[PDB]
Structure to design on (450 residues):
């Protein structure tokens, strides 16, 4: 049927669980939407310049930088809390049902994350959805972040899969662009505050859903079309 | 004395001049600090995935995406206004004074921008400071955005200069990291809402200034020191 390769943060696990930390530290939960793209930006900046540190370390460094930019005090407590929260985001209620549907429809399910491997229990284990997946891959051994081609290529290589058999699933259009550039298919789930980028020459997702249920409709539907 | 290579947007020309567009379209001037890093993020995403579109086309497409993310209506007039403001940011008042003193000290001055080659008059011509620079370079010949190594390498080549003769000046740490990874020096100017990123194994700027005058002091000083 194909292998579906899921991004984890925000796609499967709820990033807005971090809003309280941003409310407290900045006086404004909306700073989440400044910090997050800065984190992704710096992850790609390190990749482009041949540098690497684990995603969580970058997340902490960027939190400190965004704080300084806001003239917001940060304490060691705030940094430990950022870490704890980033590694304990709950699954959206639509996730286990959609994964059940995709698995029962015959899809193989895998995760692929910027986040480095964690000790057991992983955030996916803690959220109760790890068991749907046959493998949990990360960029950590590549030491390059999405959407660097090495990430998708090494993933296909580990899975022993050809690009045509793979579909990258994410609520971030940078991730689906990355995969499709490598001849994978891409599926976009439109989590709050995420919409595609319409630009000439930039691939649009093969499949689009406003939530995981609707994306799963499209994925399952394309098995018989 | 050395060749000083300036970033233009935000470093020399005032990005906060765009705030009224954000205030009006979003009801919130702070969205500037969501849109701008998303613009940079997506420029680096295209570069990592072998795609190139001109920076201003990305700027518009990201403005439209951020609008959709906020469920904010956008018209062709709003896009036009973005273009007007983005290509006409005024120079900070600390800029012409600092550039004058750098010239008097014998530094050669050039610009290097993610922004495409512009029809006359350029944003720097409009701002009244184009004439301080002996060359106005862009990412065009590299077809790749900062901090990709090709950007700096092709710049050093065009200028017939070795990396040790070059210093990249920016209020964005991603730009100084990119140049320093190619063996250039980096000079950070701390514009509002911009501070350095502190992360292990990532190069820190060679020079730092709270404004351009103070940075020009240290650059000149490092001639006598």
């Amino acid at each position: 049927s194909g292998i579906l390769v899921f991004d984890v943060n925000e796609t499967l696990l709820d990033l807005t669980s971090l809003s309280p930390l941003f409310e407290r530290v900045f006086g404004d939960a909306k700073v989440l939407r400044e910090w997050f793209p800065e984190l992704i930006l710096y992850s790609q900046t390190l990749t482009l310049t041949g540098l690497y540190r684990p995603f969580g370390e970058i997340a902490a460094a960027v939190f400190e930088m965004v704080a300084a930019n806001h003239q917001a005090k940060v304490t060691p407590d705030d940094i430990a809390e950022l870490k704890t929260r980033l590694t304990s985001m709950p699954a959206y209620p639509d996730v286990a049902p959609a994964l059940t549907r995709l698995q029962d429809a015959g899809f193989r399910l895998v995760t692929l994350t910027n986040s480095a491997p964690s000790p057991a229990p992983s955030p996916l284990e803690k959220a109760g959805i790890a068991s749907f997946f046959e493998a949990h891959l990360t960029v950590h051994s590549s030491q390059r972040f999405k959407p660097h081609p090495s990430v998708y290529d090494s993933t296909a290589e580990t899975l022993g899969a050809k690009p045509e058999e793979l579909c990258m699933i994410a609520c971030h259009i940078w991730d689906t662009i990355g995969a499709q550039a490598r001849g994978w298919r891409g599926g976009f789930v439109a989590r709050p505050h995420n919409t595609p980028l319409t630009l000439a020459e930039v691939p649009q997702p093969d499949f689009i859903g406003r939530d995981m249920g609707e994306l799963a409709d499209q994925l399952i539907a394309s098995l018989t079309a």
Q: What stands out?
A: The first strand of chain B starts at residue 3 and ends at 6. Chain B touches chain A through 43 residues (CB under 8 Å).
